[PDB]
Design a protein around this ligand. Structure first.
Ligand code: NA
Ligand SMILES: [Zn+2]
Length: 266
């Protein structure tokens, strides 16, 4: 149902809220996803490049792609949904109540909004992993390494940089000097289990669940939300996915997250 008053009553009692956030939230901030029919980067779409095969085969190109994506983030900002969440978390923490964010997104926009207890289940554009020793290190450097400066242009006729692998980002522990890769979960890679076991703990604790910028019935929101709802915990969706009447969940608020969510949480 679309009765807000009802949702708010639950919100008022809730002591542990879990907010699952999907692509619609980053979409509203203007982040290109490179899925859709016009979402190309040069000749390719995300599924061509976000794979270990692509990286093994052509690390320069994949790096050019991720560089580009890291750099466009300097002009996309958190929208009102990002903020409403972060300010909620803070407000409730003062009161001893908990709020967590389980996000599919890799743009660090929740972090930029001021959220703190965030689980990035698909990793982040702004972390690296050493192909060699596996160290996971935060990185917001621009450019991530000199070799990539001014690289990553999106128009198809752009010339490959074909950066020698020795000059792509390397792991700075000089005992190792291993080749870095973005700590994102590519197509065909599993999620990290340490994270899943945390998320599980969180979702078992939670007495209210919000699904924002996605639906509970779509992968990977489906891993989490049904689990909670089957224990009789309310679930509120905020999306403008236009989800057909017949399988929206408990409460639905159709519309842009930026519009719907902040009044929900005030
Ligand atoms: Na780990
Ligand atoms: Zn290393």
């Amino acid at each position: 149902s679309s009765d807000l008053t009802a949702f708010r009553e639950h919100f008022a009692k809730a002591k542990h809220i879990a907010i699952i956030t999907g692509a619609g939230v980053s979409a509203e901030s203007g982040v290109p996803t490179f899925r859709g029919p016009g979402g190309f980067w040069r000749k390719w779409q995300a599924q061509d490049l976000a794979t270990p095969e692509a990286f093994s085969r052509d690390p320069s190109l994949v790096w050019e792609f991720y560089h580009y994506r890291r750099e466009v983030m300097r002009s996309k900002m958190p929208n009102p949904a990002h903020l409403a969440i972060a300010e909620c978390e803070a407000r409730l923490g003062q009161q001893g109540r908990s709020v967590v964010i389980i996000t599919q997104n890799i743009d660090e926009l929740h972090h930029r909004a001021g959220s703190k207890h965030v689980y990035e289940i698909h990793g982040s554009l702004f972390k690296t992993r050493c192909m060699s020793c596996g160290e996971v290190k935060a990185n917001h450097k621009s450019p991530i390494c000199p070799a990539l400066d001014g690289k990553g242009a999106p128009d198809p006729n752009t010339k490959e940089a074909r950066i020698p692998v020795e000059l792509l980002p390397r792991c700075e522990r000089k005992s190792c000097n291993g080749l870095l890769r973005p700590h994102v979960v590519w197509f065909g890679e599993t999620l990290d289990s340490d994270i899943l076991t945390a998320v599980e703990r969180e979702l078992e604790k939670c007495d209210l669940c919000l699904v924002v910028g996605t639906s509970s019935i779509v992968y990977p929101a489906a891993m989490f939300a049904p689990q909670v709802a089957s224990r009789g915990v309310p679930v509120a969706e905020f999306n403008m996915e236009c989800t057909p009447a017949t399988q929206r969940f408990k409460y639905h608020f159709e519309g842009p997250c930026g519009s719907t969510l902040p009044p929900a949480l005030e």
